[PDB]
Write an enzyme that holds these catalytic residues in place. Structure first.
Site, PDB file in Angstrom:
ATOM      1  N   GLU A 151       6.440   0.178  13.085  1.00  0.00           N
ATOM      2  CA  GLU A 151       7.116   0.992  14.090  1.00  0.00           C
ATOM      3  C   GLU A 151       7.741   2.251  13.505  1.00  0.00           C
ATOM      4  O   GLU A 151       8.534   2.908  14.190  1.00  0.00           O
ATOM      5  CB  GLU A 151       8.186   0.165  14.805  1.00  0.00           C
ATOM      6  CG  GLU A 151       9.305  -0.323  13.892  1.00  0.00           C
ATOM      7  CD  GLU A 151       9.087  -1.747  13.374  1.00  0.00           C
ATOM      8  OE1 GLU A 151       7.929  -2.244  13.391  1.00  0.00           O
ATOM      9  OE2 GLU A 151      10.099  -2.371  12.957  1.00  0.00           O
TER      10      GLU A 151
ATOM     11  N   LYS B   7      -1.949  -0.536  -9.279  1.00  0.00           N
ATOM     12  CA  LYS B   7      -2.809   0.545  -8.816  1.00  0.00           C
ATOM     13  C   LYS B   7      -3.269   1.457  -9.940  1.00  0.00           C
ATOM     14  O   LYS B   7      -4.333   2.079  -9.814  1.00  0.00           O
ATOM     15  CB  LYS B   7      -2.126   1.338  -7.707  1.00  0.00           C
ATOM     16  CG  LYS B   7      -0.844   2.017  -8.046  1.00  0.00           C
ATOM     17  CD  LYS B   7       0.078   1.976  -6.815  1.00  0.00           C
ATOM     18  CE  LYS B   7       1.402   2.685  -7.057  1.00  0.00           C
ATOM     19  NZ  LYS B   7       1.186   4.131  -7.395  1.00  0.00           N
TER      20      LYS B   7
ATOM     21  N   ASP C 159      -5.462  -2.292  -1.937  1.00  0.00           N
ATOM     22  CA  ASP C 159      -4.148  -2.297  -1.316  1.00  0.00           C
ATOM     23  C   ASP C 159      -3.204  -1.299  -1.993  1.00  0.00           C
ATOM     24  O   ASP C 159      -3.373  -0.935  -3.157  1.00  0.00           O
ATOM     25  CB  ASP C 159      -3.549  -3.698  -1.379  1.00  0.00           C
ATOM     26  CG  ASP C 159      -2.305  -3.812  -0.543  1.00  0.00           C
ATOM     27  OD1 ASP C 159      -2.363  -3.377   0.624  1.00  0.00           O
ATOM     28  OD2 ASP C 159      -1.268  -4.286  -1.049  1.00  0.00           O
ATOM     29  N   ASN C 160      -2.182  -0.873  -1.246  1.00  0.00           N
ATOM     30  CA  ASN C 160      -1.104  -0.046  -1.802  1.00  0.00           C
ATOM     31  C   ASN C 160      -1.623   1.293  -2.307  1.00  0.00           C
ATOM     32  O   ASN C 160      -1.237   1.774  -3.382  1.00  0.00           O
ATOM     33  CB  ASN C 160      -0.368  -0.791  -2.911  1.00  0.00           C
ATOM     34  CG  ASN C 160       0.949  -0.157  -3.243  1.00  0.00           C
ATOM     35  OD1 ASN C 160       1.536   0.535  -2.408  1.00  0.00           O
ATOM     36  ND2 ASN C 160       1.414  -0.357  -4.475  1.00  0.00           N
TER      37      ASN C 160
ATOM     38  N   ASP D 227      -5.597  -5.504  -5.877  1.00  0.00           N
ATOM     39  CA  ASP D 227      -4.263  -5.897  -5.468  1.00  0.00           C
ATOM     40  C   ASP D 227      -3.248  -5.446  -6.522  1.00  0.00           C
ATOM     41  O   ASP D 227      -3.518  -5.531  -7.724  1.00  0.00           O
ATOM     42  CB  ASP D 227      -4.243  -7.407  -5.285  1.00  0.00           C
ATOM     43  CG  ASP D 227      -2.955  -7.901  -4.684  1.00  0.00           C
ATOM     44  OD1 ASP D 227      -2.530  -7.357  -3.636  1.00  0.00           O
ATOM     45  OD2 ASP D 227      -2.361  -8.809  -5.281  1.00  0.00           O
TER      46      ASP D 227
END
Length: 216
Positions: free
Chosen positions: A197, A142, A167-168, A139
């Site tokens: 979207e 990074k 993640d990320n 988490d």
């Protein structure tokens, strides 16, 4: 009383239902989306986190890194009675907010927060009745994903089938962690890109399932 992580906790405390993890997650999500700090985390990473846990039902999850506690709540709410989450985080303020977030959700019994650097705490897991891990969630930090993964291997904490979920991980970030797990014969890799979207990735996650030796 004004860091972003304190403000998130305050919003949850004022708006979420005590003892209801779903309500806590939704409040974090709602607030972070409105402030434009993180768009629709539930859709962008929460749903992928859930699937990975539910496809393996782990007994022991290690979370490396925490900020406001969203991820710990998200994982801890799915753990069965014999299962538990260990969360390591070096920043004592983030660890404190994460603890209070879990308390508000009623999940403190599922989690042990360890405050310290991962390079100091990972080699001490022997001292917590920890042989191997079923799942590791990387988490937030990074630049530490590759060092952490190497240290987990060196400490013998990964077994065949241990799931690492990071993640990320969005190209062209984390080039070293990705080149490592994708190039290594000790991992089978799947990448998840959540666009919501939009035309650009909102969150990306890498699932790397260990298949190498249990002993370093």
């Amino acid at each position: 009383g004004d860091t972003k992580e304190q403000r998130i906790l305050r919003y949850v405390q004022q708006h979420a239902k005590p003892g209801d993890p779903q309500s806590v997650l939704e409040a974090i999500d709602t607030y972070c989306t409105q402030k434009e700090w993180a768009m629709n985390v539930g859709d962008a990473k929460g749903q992928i986190m859930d699937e990975v846990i539910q496809e393996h039902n782990p007994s022991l999850v290690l979370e490396l890194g925490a900020y406001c506690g969203y991820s710990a709540v998200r994982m801890a709410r799915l753990l069965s009675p014999g299962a538990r989450l260990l969360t390591m985080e070096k920043n004592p303020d983030y660890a404190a907010i994460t603890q209070q977030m879990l308390n508000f959700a009623g999940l403190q019994d599922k989690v042990t927060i360890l405050i310290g650097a991962s390079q100091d705490l990972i080699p001490q897991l022997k001292k917590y009745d920890v042989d191997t891990l079923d799942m590791v969630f990387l988490d937030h930090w990074k630049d530490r994903y590759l060092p952490d993964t190497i240290l987990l291997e060196e400490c013998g904490l990964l077994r065949k089938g241990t799931v690492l979920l990071a993640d990320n991980v969005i190209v062209p970030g984390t080039p070293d962690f990705l080149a490592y797990v994708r190039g290594s014969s000790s991992f089978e890799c799947t990448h998840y890109s959540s666009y919501l979207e939009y035309m650009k990735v909102v969150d990306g996650l890498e699932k790397a399932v260990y298949k190498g030796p249990s002993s370093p």
